[PDB]
Design an enzyme around this catalytic site. Structure first.
Site, PDB file in Angstrom:
ATOM      1  CD  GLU A 171       1.127   0.412   2.836  1.00 54.07           C
ATOM      2  OE1 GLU A 171       0.868   2.021   2.920  1.00 54.07           O
ATOM      3  OE2 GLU A 171       2.243  -0.146   3.222  1.00 54.07           O
ATOM      4  CD  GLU A 314       6.824   2.511  -0.761  1.00 50.55           C
ATOM      5  OE1 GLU A 314       7.926   1.761  -1.824  1.00 50.55           O
ATOM      6  OE2 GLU A 314       7.736   3.352  -0.427  1.00 50.55           O
TER       7      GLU A 314
HETATM    8  C1  LIG Z   1       8.592   8.669   1.728  1.00 43.98           C
HETATM    9  C2  LIG Z   1       7.961   9.222   2.515  1.00 43.98           C
HETATM   10  C3  LIG Z   1       6.517   8.692   3.177  1.00 43.98           C
HETATM   11  C4  LIG Z   1       6.509   6.957   2.661  1.00 43.98           C
HETATM   12  N1  LIG Z   1       5.831   5.859   2.867  1.00 43.98           N
HETATM   13  C5  LIG Z   1       5.773   5.204   1.641  1.00 43.98           C
HETATM   14  N2  LIG Z   1       6.548   4.863   1.389  1.00 43.98           N
HETATM   15  C6  LIG Z   1       7.261   6.722   1.571  1.00 43.98           C
HETATM   16  C7  LIG Z   1       8.601   7.368   0.714  1.00 43.98           C
END
Ligand SMILES: c1ccc2[nH]cnc2c1
Ligand SMILES: c1ccc2[nH]cnc2c1
Lengths: 346, 346
Positions: A171, A314
């Site tokens: 996500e 992610e």
């Molecule tokens: C920079 C800041 C928040 C994030 N959340 C997921 N990937 C990121 C990169």
């Protein structure tokens, strides 16, 4: 949708029994490869894998969306980061992209509700520009949640037709650890204080406000713990719904799906509430450093393979675990047998 | 040998500082990749890696030897299995071979004391046909232990000249969990009962005898806990010595070495006692299902990345972890930077 849930296949006990017997005769003391053996057997029981632990193409689906609750000051990352990172996903410079590339998997970026203009290269499935602020009302309508579940489910099982046999879920959504905590609290019956973490480096002083926001969302919405779709639509988010959709789709397709971190545990709790038949298809990856990880995992009765103290999200953890799944398949198919070496053990 | 220990390089703090700074600016919330970040920094400080986390060729060294203590009835696996499995290592059908192949690593099988005729294809470094029965006397002379340490150390750092930058250690030797337990008991000061496991499926009823054998070996030999070579030669084995030699050699070479299971923890305890400078070069892989694993790891102040309940040995866990090391390198070199995306975080 009722057809979707109704048609999820049960695991193939026959293939699993044949799998266990084969693993027992491999060149090693019985049971010595531990969770690698149990994983191989689990895989063998998944109908979409054709009776044997195998891995064809791999894909990681990253659901991206924005949350109205961001306005409650529960996240320090600028809201625009969701959209910027979504774009970076298309250029392969993000954490998941780099780790998926290492595992030989392809990353599919899906926009289910980013509060920004459409991003070229990203799969468009947006419900709206960000979901409602769960602190003052529901994130979305039940109809919107059901519609997205079906859409994502179809897309997921459709990839199975392209050779994909292993999925990973991820996500991208600033402030999404808040709705994630709300859902975990509701499903596990744990107090908000016990499952609210610092997410993306939230200062220790701002934690109190986050816990209060979680309680207000639950109090105001009164989500029904026995209704997974009610919980998702009320105190979840578009991304959370999407992740749940991937799990329902993989399950319907009879294929395995690797979880990621805390956000994914919340979605798995919902998926299993909606359809318990989904459980046999879920594979944990790592043990998230998020505070409520232990609680969520206990309720899913899952023990992750990796302890990396990771909390990026992610779908990075899912990608990191893919080699482990392939390793279980390699063991199964490539190891020699005891009988062949005339080795006899008690 | 005194030159070997004397010349082990200290970690490069300068490269480590540059590494940390670079990791902090990557496209993710600072510290969000947890142990993957700390691993990358650890790698950067190893002189043999040229100031940056990188992985070239990979090799797993499997030390094979037989033990006289097998006659004490501490193992249910036939003694001949050591020799049979050593041969299978040359045909790539063993657990380590299959997993190393998956990680793109080459397996080097080394005979340091198998009680059988020489096996073609296996590297010959045998000290004798099996070591002495530690229950009634020492496993070997101090001179034999020192000689093997140097021999294996040279072979190890020699591979570094062939492009190898990452090592994995393993073993093969029926009954070797007995001397392993003895060493752990001596180095950690724990009672034998607390560190003696079932090894290769030893029946629960035969455990008592194994614990007694461990105590007799310690009582009769009186190994000095402050002298790593004294402990190895008295209550260790040729394989244990060989594993320690790989660690000393990799360290001298300024290169990383992945541990495996309980047998390898015992050897690491000895290596660090002999030369504390070896510690910065050791990388844990998995958390062995052997009873004394928790104790051994605590004394090495190590927390494995993988929880697979594995207990096969052979260096299989080391091979399974190689992808993780490569993942830390991929993160370091391939991820984009926050500044490039105009993302600013507190
Ligand atoms: C920079 C800041 C928040 C994030 N959340 C997921 N990937 C990121 C990169
Ligand atoms: C029996 C068979 C294979 C083995 N590999 C390591 N120890 C073993 C015992």
């Amino acid at each position: 949708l009722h057809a979707l849930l109704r048609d999820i296949p049960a695991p193939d006990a026959e293939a699993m029994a044949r799998t266990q017997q084969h693993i027992d005769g491999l060149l090693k003391p019985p049971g010595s490869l531990g969770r690698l053996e149990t994983l191989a057997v689990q895989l063998a029981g998944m109908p979409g894998l054709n009776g044997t632990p195998q891995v064809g193409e791999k894909a990681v689906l990253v659901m991206c969306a924005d949350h109205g609750v961001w306005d409650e000051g529960v996240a320090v990352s600028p809201k625009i980061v969701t959209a910027i990172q979504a774009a970076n996903m298309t250029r392969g410079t993000t954490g998941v992209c780099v780790l998926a590339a290492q595992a030989g998997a392809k990353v599919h970026v899906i926009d289910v509700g980013i509060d920004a203009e459409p991003i070229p290269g990203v799969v468009n499935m947006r419900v709206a520009r960000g979901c409602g602020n769960i602190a003052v009302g529901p994130a979305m309508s039940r109809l919107q949640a059901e519609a997205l579940l079906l859409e994502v489910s179809r897309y997921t099982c459709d990839l199975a037709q392209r050779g994909v046999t292993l999925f990973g879920v991820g996500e991208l959504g600033m402030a999404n650890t808040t709705p994630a905590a709300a859902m975990v609290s509701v499903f596990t019956g744990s107090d908000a204080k016990e499952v609210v973490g610092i997410g993306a480096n939230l200062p220790p002083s701002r934690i109190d406000n986050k816990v209060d926001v979680v309680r207000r969302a639950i109090a105001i919405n009164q989500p029904n713990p026995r209704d997974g779709i009610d919980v998702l639509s009320k105190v979840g988010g578009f991304d959370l719904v999407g992740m749940t959709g991937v799990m329902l789709g993989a399950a319907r397709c009879g294929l395995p799906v690797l979880l990621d971190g805390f956000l994914s545990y919340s979605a798995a709790l919902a998926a299993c509430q909606i359809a318990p038949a989904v459980r046999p298809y879920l594979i944990p990856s790592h043990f998230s450093a998020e505070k409520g990880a232990r609680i969520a995992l206990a309720h899913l009765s899952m023990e992750p393979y990796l302890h990396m103290a990771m909390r990026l999200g992610e779908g990075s953890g899912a990608a990191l675990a893919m080699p482990i799944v392939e390793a279980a398949c390699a063991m199964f198919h490539n190891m020699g047998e005891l009988a062949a070496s005339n080795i006899v053990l008690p």
